[PDB]
Design a protein around this ligand. Structure first.
Ligand SMILES: *[C@@H]1O[C@H](CO)[C@@H](O[C@@H]2O[C@H](CO)[C@@H](O[C@@H]3O[C@H](CO)[C@@H](O)[C@H](O[C@H]4O[C@H](CO)[C@@H](O)[C@H](O)[C@@H]4O)[C@@H]3O)[C@H](O)[C@H]2NC(C)=O)[C@H](O)[C@H]1NC(C)=O
Ligand SMILES: *[C@@H]1O[C@H](CO)[C@@H](O[C@@H]2O[C@H](CO)[C@@H](O[C@@H]3O[C@H](CO)[C@@H](O)[C@H](O[C@H]4O[C@H](CO)[C@@H](O)[C@H](O)[C@@H]4O)[C@@H]3O)[C@H](O)[C@H]2NC(C)=O)[C@H](O)[C@H]1NC(C)=O
Ligand SMILES: *[C@@H]1O[C@H](CO)[C@@H](O[C@@H]2O[C@H](CO)[C@@H](O[C@@H]3O[C@H](CO)[C@@H](O)[C@H](O[C@H]4O[C@H](CO)[C@@H](O)[C@H](O)[C@@H]4O)[C@@H]3O)[C@H](O)[C@H]2NC(C)=O)[C@H](O)[C@H]1NC(C)=O
Ligand SMILES: *[C@@H]1O[C@H](CO)[C@@H](O[C@@H]2O[C@H](CO)[C@@H](O[C@@H]3O[C@H](CO)[C@@H](O)[C@H](O)[C@@H]3O)[C@H](O)[C@H]2NC(C)=O)[C@H](O)[C@H]1NC(C)=O
Ligand SMILES: *[C@@H]1O[C@H](CO)[C@@H](O[C@@H]2O[C@H](CO)[C@@H](O)[C@H](O)[C@H]2NC(C)=O)[C@H](O)[C@H]1NC(C)=O
Ligand SMILES: *[C@@H]1O[C@H](CO)[C@@H](O[C@@H]2O[C@H](CO)[C@@H](O)[C@H](O)[C@H]2NC(C)=O)[C@H](O)[C@H]1NC(C)=O
Ligand SMILES: *[C@@H]1O[C@H](CO)[C@@H](O[C@@H]2O[C@H](CO)[C@@H](O)[C@H](O)[C@H]2NC(C)=O)[C@H](O)[C@H]1NC(C)=O
Ligand SMILES: *[C@@H]1O[C@H](CO)[C@@H](O[C@@H]2O[C@H](CO)[C@@H](O)[C@H](O)[C@H]2NC(C)=O)[C@H](O)[C@H]1NC(C)=O
Ligand SMILES: *[C@@H]1O[C@H](CO)[C@@H](O[C@@H]2O[C@H](CO)[C@@H](O)[C@H](O)[C@H]2NC(C)=O)[C@H](O)[C@H]1NC(C)=O
Ligand SMILES: *[C@@H]1O[C@H](CO)[C@@H](O)[C@H](O)[C@H]1NC(C)=O
Ligand SMILES: *[C@@H]1O[C@H](CO)[C@@H](O)[C@H](O)[C@H]1NC(C)=O
Ligand SMILES: *[C@@H]1O[C@H](CO)[C@@H](O)[C@H](O)[C@H]1NC(C)=O
Lengths: 137, 411, 97, 49, 48
């Protein structure tokens, strides 16, 4: 066997022609980009969101200068938060829970609190209680 | 003919509320990130952006569908400690406190009967074609919290649940109130709470048998899956079509041909593959609207059924609707409808009015029914021989003006 | 090719004729529970009562009511015989195909 | 051929829209009694055929 | 104002529930019985 293909017809694995190692072949990387913003009338900082990509290969290639597009004025800011949707860069992960302002994915939801752009876990609603008895209305 | 007896049974109802939202990078689909690709591709101007906007607008609806359907309760309620109210056993419908799943036992039966492309599970992976499937805003856990805080609400607060703040009431109290709404006296409730509980707890175990032993009740959920499968598979399969070039491989067309013709054949390769996406965008744009039609069913079959009382026939199932309980499922909603079904009919004899004291005596409601021994007023939902008084009947005009009467007495 | 439908023309009106034959004897319980025998003016007195006019008005007037929609049934047969544009939405289904 | 199939999938979504409204009026207004205003004829609905 | 008399009436409505169901032989529509058409049909794949 020379090399392997996936369940679909692209090549994903190859036996090394000199030393017979069975490598895996993955795509190089890509993905979409969102920009999260509170509006020009409130701020002019944003947190960008690299969708569906490992944050290891995100943060390296920005330092190692391999993204197309390339930005003139841009920093990591040491705030990269691994989430289900992707790699959120620029917003501080608070471990709080408010109502969802701007959706992101899998219960993660950005907002703008006291000011900077914050990301957190969505609250569903107020935890009320109804006391229960058999004789009271 | 008027029925005597009755038997509550529970009917399941299944409907989808969202579909799997997708996205496509064009460059990793159209060619596979070659320079020879990106050369000719920019002379079409902007065409990937029109495909980016349509697949986003589909992707916004799927959250917006599931948000409106479920989040109609703005007060999340603590599930009550006792789960056995009036002899009725909600334990298989509320979330069970033992296991850390926060699902009912029945919802667990619903996932186990209906459960390529890049997707991250937090194990991420990615495919060569530009196809990807994004995760929703609302996770599976949060939906089961909304279902739990909805079953817990009407197991406590009754029909008052959706009038505003959910207002505490006994359970058998409001069960009688729903018996008024179907035109049956609530004597039938209070005098029979033992075997009503025997029937109500029997039916839920009977549906439990059904969702374990057989299948295909949730085919309307699998159908949403099978159309995501085929549209993504057929989109893949048109990569290996040539559209008139010498190859499906961009590099073979690159290698073995001169730029007088290799330009021409990969230009065929581009516009052949732009129409494969433009096909794929459109069929995703249609059945988004067929799901959005089924989404506003589930939005109205949760307000007008679970939060209130159904009056329309076969809306919320056959028979006299009493109340109904939602459950979640992967990309869908499974309902459980508690129904009132009459039985044990008897052939009696009627009279539209009775002649007594020379006057016309109409039933105020119901009918005068003569069983062969005496006359009385009862309803058609249920047999209950209420003796004809001066109060449950009424007077207008004298005797022998309406047609087909019975000469009789009024106490 | 245009394919023939599963439910033929005969079986369609076989459902409809059985449906009207039901509710001429079975009443409003024909959809809710099982079909239950009830004399026909009893159904009418009920359905008067359900719309906010008490069944005084049927029983005192069982023949004026009989005369009026027996007129109005035949007026439809006049209007279906002579004129048009009342079935346009069925034809435009046929035209657009 | 591809264009014709698209302009059939639209119209079959038009029929599927109104065949759900026909199965609803036949369930409510025939086999029962409606109380919905200016639905199933005009005036006060009695029964239907 | 309170009405004193009444009048019953029958009004009609009509709804389509169906349309004509068709099918298309893709082979015979595009080619029309030329095999040399059908040879070049196969490289376009299973579009039919
Ligand atoms: C309300 O309805 C619920 C329906 O779920 C009902 O609760 C269930 O009752 C059954 C038995 O009545 C429970 O099953 C038991 O589960 C324990 C858990 O450890 C098992 O160990 C038991 O298995 C032993 O006993 C069986 C008896 O034949 C043997 O067959 C078996 O091999 C083992 O020897 C036992 O099956 C079930 O766990 C509960 N579920 C819940 C959520 O409580 C409850 O009784 C109803 N309540 C009222 C008041 O009616
Ligand atoms: C993004 O890419 C990075 C790499 O660039 C990737 O990090 C690696 O993840 C894998 C898991 O996906 C890690 O593998 C395991 O990690 C645990 C945690 O320390 C170790 O204990 C494991 O060692 C044991 O487990 C193996 C299998 O369970 C055994 O076979 C083995 O013998 C050991 O007993 C194992 O190493 C891996 O360590 C990291 N590496 C680094 C450098 O981080 C990351 O997961 C990717 N992220 C996403 C979101 O995809
Ligand atoms: C409420 O409305 C209804 C209908 O609008 C109405 O019922 C009508 O009552 C009148 C009088 O009872 C009826 O008119 C008569 O009908 C008979 C039968 O055809 C005729 O023979 C009568 O003809 C005599 O009178 C004519 C006019 O003076 C003469 O020209 C003729 O030669 C005869 O002498 C007369 O037309 C009418 O038919 C009914 N309508 C129906 C549908 O039955 C009712 O009276 C109204 N309520 C009140 C309180 O008025
Ligand atoms: C109205 O209907 C209900 C159910 O539809 C009837 O209740 C059931 O009545 C039967 C007898 O007709 C009972 O069967 C008996 O059960 C006991 C114990 O299981 C057994 O020892 C006997 O040999 C017989 O099988 C049945 O239990 C009972 N069901 C319940 C839940 O109580 C009811 O009788 C009907 N009303 C009238 C007036 O008949
Ligand atoms: C190609 O040559 C290399 C070295 O010249 C081979 O590597 C040796 O592989 C054998 C087993 O295949 C090992 O026992 C040796 O230890 C390897 N050499 C060294 C220096 O470590 C390789 O096998 C050759 N390729 C093939 C297909 O036989
Ligand atoms: C941006 O927001 C500010 C609010 O901080 C707006 O300024 C005020 O607007 C309100 C009514 O919109 C006026 O009553 C105030 O007098 C405004 N204050 C000032 C200092 O201008 C501002 O108009 C907004 N601009 C845009 C483009 O949205
Ligand atoms: C009426 O009954 C309700 C039942 O919950 C009582 O409500 C709770 O009462 C506790 C203490 O009694 C408070 O800490 C909670 O905040 C109350 N919850 C709600 C939703 O009101 C309530 O106190 C009772 N009121 C009276 C006047 O007896
Ligand atoms: C309904 O619940 C109440 C609890 O509030 C139960 O009432 C208590 O019953 C016990 C014995 O059953 C008595 O010792 C208490 O004095 C009662 N307290 C009150 C406030 O009533 C009642 O038993 C329950 N109903 C039924 C039918 O069991
Ligand atoms: C017809 O209904 C009457 C009541 O409306 C029944 O008469 C009762 O019969 C029971 C037992 O036979 C007596 O205890 C009551 O005193 C009777 N009441 C009256 C008002 O008559 C009669 O039994 C019914 N007939 C049938 C065949 O069921
Ligand atoms: C009693 O009712 C049933 C069902 O409607 C009918 O089949 C039977 O003939 C009736 N018996 C009498 C005596 O009317
Ligand atoms: C009922 O019908 C019978 C004939 O079937 C008839 O003799 C009788 O007069 C009718 N009664 C009424 C009140 O219409
Ligand atoms: C009822 O019987 C009385 C005799 O006690 C008679 O005068 C009257 O006319 C009768 N009514 C009918 C409607 O038969």
């Amino acid at each position: 066997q020379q090399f392997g293909r996936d369940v679909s017809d692209f090549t994903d694995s190859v036996r090394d022609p000199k030393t017979s190692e069975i490598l895996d072949i993955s795509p190089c990387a890509f993905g979409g980009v969102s920009v999260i913003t509170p509006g020009t009338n409130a701020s002019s900082e944003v947190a960008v969101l690299y969708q569906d990509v490992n944050c290891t290969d995100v943060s390296t290639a920005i330092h190692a200068d391999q993204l197309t597009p390339a930005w003139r004025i841009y920093s990591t800011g040491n705030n990269v938060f691994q989430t289900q949707a992707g790699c959120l860069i620029g917003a501080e992960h608070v471990d709080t829970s408010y109502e969802c302002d701007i959706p992101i994915g899998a219960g993660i939801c950005a907002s703008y609190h006291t000011k900077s752009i914050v990301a957190y876990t969505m609250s569903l609603g107020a935890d009320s209680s109804i006391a229960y008895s058999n004789n009271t209305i | 003919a008027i029925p005597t007896n009755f038997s509550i049974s529970i009917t399941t109802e299944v409907m989808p509320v969202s579909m799997a939202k997708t996205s496509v990078d064009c460059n990793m689909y159209i060619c596979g990130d070659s320079t020879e690709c990106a050369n000719l591709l920019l002379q079409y101007g902007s065409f990937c952006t029109q495909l980016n906007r349509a697949l986003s607008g589909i992707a916004a609806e799927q959250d917006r569908n599931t948000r409106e359907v479920f989040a109609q309760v703005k007060q999340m309620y603590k599930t009550p400690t006792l789960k056995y109210f009036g002899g009725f056993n909600f334990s298989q419908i509320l979330p069970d406190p033992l296991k850390p799943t926060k699902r009912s036992f029945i919802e667990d039966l619903l996932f186990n009967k209906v459960t390529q492309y890049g997707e991250c599970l937090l194990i991420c992976a990615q495919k060569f074609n530009g196809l990807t499937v994004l995760p929703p805003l609302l996770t599976d856990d949060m939906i089961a919290a909304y279902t739990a805080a909805l079953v817990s609400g009407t197991a406590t607060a009754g029909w008052t649940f959706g009038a505003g703040a959910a207002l505490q009431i006994p359970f058998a109290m409001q069960m009688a109130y729903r018996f008024n709404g179907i035109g049956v006296t609530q004597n039938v409730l209070y005098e029979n709470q033992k075997q009503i509980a025997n029937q109500f707890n029997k039916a839920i175990s009977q549906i439990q048998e059904s969702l374990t032993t057989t299948s295909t009740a949730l085919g309307k959920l699998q159908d949403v899956v099978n159309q995501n499968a085929q549209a993504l598979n057929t989109l893949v399969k048109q990569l290996s079509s040539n559209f008139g070039a010498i190859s499906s491989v961009l590099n073979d067309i690159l290698s073995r041909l001169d730029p007088p013709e290799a330009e021409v054949q990969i230009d065929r390769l581009i516009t052949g593959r732009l129409q494969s996406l433009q096909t794929y965008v459109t069929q995703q744009l249609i059945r988004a609207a067929e799901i959005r039609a089924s989404a506003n069913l589930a939005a109205t079959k949760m307000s007008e059924c679970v939060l209130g009382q159904s009056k329309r026939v076969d809306f919320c199932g056959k028979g006299y609707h009493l109340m109904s309980f939602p459950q979640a499922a992967p990309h869908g909603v499974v309902f459980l409808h508690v129904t009132y079904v009459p039985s044990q009919e008897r052939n009696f004899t009627t009279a539209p009015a009775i002649c007594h004291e020379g006057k016309a005596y109409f039933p105020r409601e119901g009918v005068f029914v003569f069983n062969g021994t005496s006359w009385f007023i009862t309803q058609r939902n249920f047999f209950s021989p209420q003796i004809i008084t001066t109060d449950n009947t009424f007077v207008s005009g004298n005797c022998d003006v309406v047609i087909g009467i019975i000469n009789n007495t009024v106490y």
